[PDB]
C-alpha cells in the first residue's frame, strides 16, 4: 500500500508490496516521459494507468496480455466495460461460454476471476487510435513484464504478429504461448482454441485449474 509522489499527473502512485522491487525505477522512467504524454488527451484518462498495481502478485496464477488499451473510453482495466459494449470482452465471453455451457448472462469482466491478471502492455494511447504511444511506454512495459513473469508461470499473449519476438524480450524460460486477436477478422477465435490448455499446463506444473465461470455477471 506504499505510495510515491511523481513529477506529473496524476502525481501519486499507490503500489502493493509485490510491486516494490520495481517501483523504485518506475518513477525514474516516468518523470522524463509524462511531460510529452499529456500534451494530448488520452484514454484511459491520466487518473488511471497504474490502477492494477495495487493488486497482489502471489494470488495470481495466469496473466492475459492485451497489448493495447481501448481506443474509445477505457477504464484502466483491460478488456473492461460497464455495459458489455466492446468487442474484445464480447468475443472473450463468447468463446468462454462456448466451453462452460451457460449462455444466458448479464455482462462480463475478466478481473474478478481468481488467478488471472488482466494486463495491458501499453498503459495508454491517444483517443480513437492505437499503438500511438509505443514510443513512451516501452521500457516501462519491459520492466513490468520481467517483474510479472516470475510470479506467474504462464503467458498467453493476444496478438499473432505483435508479440512476435517477446521470447527474446524475456530472460526466464517461462511457459510463453501465443494467441490470436478475437476482435480481429477471419474469426480468429473461431479457428483457435485459446483456453482448455490453461488448466493443462496448470496441471503438469501440479497446480489448480482456472475458474473460467466466475467472470460472468447475472
Amino acid at each position: 500500500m506504499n505510495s510515491v509522489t511523481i513529477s506529473h499527473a496524476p502525481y501519486t502512485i499507490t503500489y502493493h508490496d509485490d510491486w516494490e522491487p520495481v517501483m523504485s525505477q518506475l518513477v525514474e522512467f516516468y518523470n522524463e516521459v509524462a511531460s510529452w504524454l499529456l500534451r494530448d488527451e488520452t484514454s484511459p484518462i491520466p487518473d488511471k494507468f497504474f490502477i492494477q498495481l495495487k493488486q497482489p502478485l502471489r494470488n495470481k496464477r495466469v496473466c492475459v496480455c492485451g497489448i493495447d488499451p481501448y481506443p474509445k473510453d477505457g477504464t484502466g482495466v483491460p478488456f473492461e466495460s460497464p455495459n458489455f459494449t466492446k468487442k474484445s470482452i464480447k468475443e472473450i465471453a463468447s468463446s468462454i461460454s462456448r466451453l462452460t455451457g451457460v449462455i444466458d448472462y448479464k455482462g462480463y469482466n475478466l478481473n474478478i476471476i481468481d488467478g488471472v491478471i488482466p494486463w495491458n502492455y501499453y498503459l495508454s494511447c491517444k483517443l480513437g487510435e492505437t499503438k500511438s504511444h509505443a514510443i513512451y511506454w516501452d521500457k516501462i512495459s519491459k520492466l513490468l513484464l520481467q517483474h510479472i513473469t516470475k510470479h506467474v508461470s504462464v503467458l498467453y499473449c493476444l496478438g499473432k504478429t505483435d508479440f512476435s519476438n517477446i521470447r527474446a524480450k524475456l530472460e526466464s524460460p517461462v511457459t510463453t504461448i501465443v494467441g490470436y486477436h478475437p476482435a480481429a477478422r477471419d474469426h480468429q477465435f473461431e479457428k483457435d482454441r485459446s483456453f482448455e490448455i490453461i488448466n493443462v499446463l496448470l496441471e503438469l506444473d501440479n497446480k489448480t485449474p482456472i475458474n473460467w465461470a466466475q467472470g460472468f455477471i447475472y
Partner: protein
C-alpha cells in the same frame, strides 16, 4: 500454432509422467521423445540412516537441480562432511556452496585448474595437502574437471607391520569415544568405527598390517590367517573397553541418566533427572503405577530396550550371574557361539545399559509398592 495434436502429446506425457517409475518400455521411449518435443514448446516435463540434521539441508540442496539423486557424505569423527552429490547436470561448484549455506560441513575446495588430464605426484599432492588443513581425516585427493560428472583420484601410501600393546577409547564428542590403537613404539593408530576394529581381529601384543600415510596413518584391513571366530573378538573387546560403555550405533557411550531418560520415555511421563523424582511421578500417576504393578522387572527393563522377544533368552541362558538384594552386581557369558549370530551381538554389546536400567527399575518397584 496451438492445435489439438500438441494437446494429445502433452496428455500422454501427463498420464505416464508419474507412471515413469515402473512403466512399460514403449512408454519410457515415448517419454524420452516427448520430453524432447515439449521442452521446446512447454518448458517443463553403502550408506545408512542419516539423521535429520543433514537430511533437511539435503532436502534443500536437492532442489538446486533435479538431476540430483543423492548426496555423497563422508562420515568422519562423528561428522557428516559432504564432498559432492550425484547430480546429472549441475556441477557441484554451486552445490558445496549451497551445502555451506544450509549447514553442511564442506571441505577446503582447493582445486587446481587442470588442462591436460594428469595424476598428481609428490608436490602435486603434497602442496595441496598443506593448503587443505584437514582436521578431518580425509585422504582421497580427487579433482573434479568441470564438464564431466566424474573425478580424478590420486593417493599414495605405504604399509608395514606395527606392534600393538593395548587398545583405548578417546572422547570425540558428547559421551562418545573411539579406539586409538596404542603401539609398543608409543604411536596411536586410528580406525573408523567399532566394526572396523572387530573385522581386524585386533588384539594385544603382536604385529599387524597398518597403512602408513603422511598426514594420517590408518590401521589396515585384515588379510592373514583367521581362525579366531568373531564372537571371541566381540567378547574380548567388550571386556577391554570397560564396563562403563555400551555401544550406540558406530560408537560407544557411557551408561548414565540415559537409562532414566529411556525409561521416562517408555512410561509417558516427564523427564526425571533423579530416581526419587521418578518414584514421585509414578506414584502420582495412578495409571503408570497400576501398569507397573502387573509386570516383572525383567520384561519391563527389556521392553524399554526393544530386544525383540526371544533371542534375548538364548543370550540370557548362556551366562552366569551375581546377584544380591535381587540386584545384579556381576555377570559373565561362558558360551561364545551365539555371538556369531548378527541379531545376537547387537544385543550383547548393548548390555551394560540393560543391567543398569534393570537395577534402577528394581529399585523403583521396591520403593513404590513399599
Amino acid at each position: 500454432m496451438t492445435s489439438s495434436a500438441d494437446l494429445t502429446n502433452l496428455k500422454e506425457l501427463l498420464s505416464l509422467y508419474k507412471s515413469l517409475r515402473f512403466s512399460d518400455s514403449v512408454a519410457i521411449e515415448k517419454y524420452n521423445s516427448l520430453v524432447e518435443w515439449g521442452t521446446s514448446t512447454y518448458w517443463k516435463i553403502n550408506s545408512f540412516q542419516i539423521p535429520d540434521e543433514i537430511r533437511s539441508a539435503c532436502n534443500k540442496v536437492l532442489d538446486s537441480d533435479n538431476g540430483i539423486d543423492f548426496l555423497r557424505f563422508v562420515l568422519l569423527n562423528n561428522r557428516w562432511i559432504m564432498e559432492d552429490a550425484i547430480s546429472k547436470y549441475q556441477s557441484p561448484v554451486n552445490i558445496f556452496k549451497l551445502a555451506s549455506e544450509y549447514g553442511l560441513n564442506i571441505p577446503n575446495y582447493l582445486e587446481i585448474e587442470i588442462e591436460e588430464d594428469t595424476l598428481f605426484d609428490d608436490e602435486l599432492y603434497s602442496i595441496m595437502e598443506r593448503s587443505f588443513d584437514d582436521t578431518f581425516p580425509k585422504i582421497s585427493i580427487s579433482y573434479i574437471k568441470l564438464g564431466e560428472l566424474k573425478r580424478q583420484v590420486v593417493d599414495f601410501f605405504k604399509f608395514s607391520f606395527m606392534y600393538i600393546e593395548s587398545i583405548k577409547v578417546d572422547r570425540i564428542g558428547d559421551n562418545i569415544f573411539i579406539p586409538s590403537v596404542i603401539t609398543k613404539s608409543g604411536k596411536k593408530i586410528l580406525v573408523k568405527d567399532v566394526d572396523h576394529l572387530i573385522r581386524s581381529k585386533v588384539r594385544e601384543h603382536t604385529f599387524v598390517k597398518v597403512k602408513k600415510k603422511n598426514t594420517f596413518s590408518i590401521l589396515y584391513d585384515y588379510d592373514g590367517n583367521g581362525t579366531e571366530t568373531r564372537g571371541e573378538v566381540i567378547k574380548r573387546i567388550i571386556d577391554t573397553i570397560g564396563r562403563d560403555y555400551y555401544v550406540n550405533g558406530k560408537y560407544f557411550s557411557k551408561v548414565g541418566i540415559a537409562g532414566l531418560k529411556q525409561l521416562t520415555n517408555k512410561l509417558d511421563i516427564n523427564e526425571c533427572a533423579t530416581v526419587d523424582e521418578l518414584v514421585d511421578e509414578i506414584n502420582k500417576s495412578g495409571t503408570v503405577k497400576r501398569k507397573i504393578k502387573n509386570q516383572s522387572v525383567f520384561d519391563l527393563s527389556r521392553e524399554c530396550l526393544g530386544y525383540p522377544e526371544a533371542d534375548f533368552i538364548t543370550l540370557v541362558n548362556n551366562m552366569r550371574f551375581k546377584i544380591e538384594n535381587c540386584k545384579v552386581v556381576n555377570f559373565n557369558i561362558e558360551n561364545t557361539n551365539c555371538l556369531n549370530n548378527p541379531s545376537i551381538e547387537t544385543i550383547y554389546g548393548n548390555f551394560n545399559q540393560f543391567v543398569s536400567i534393570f537395577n534402577t527399575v528394581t529399585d523403583v518397584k521396591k520403593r513404590l509398592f513399599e
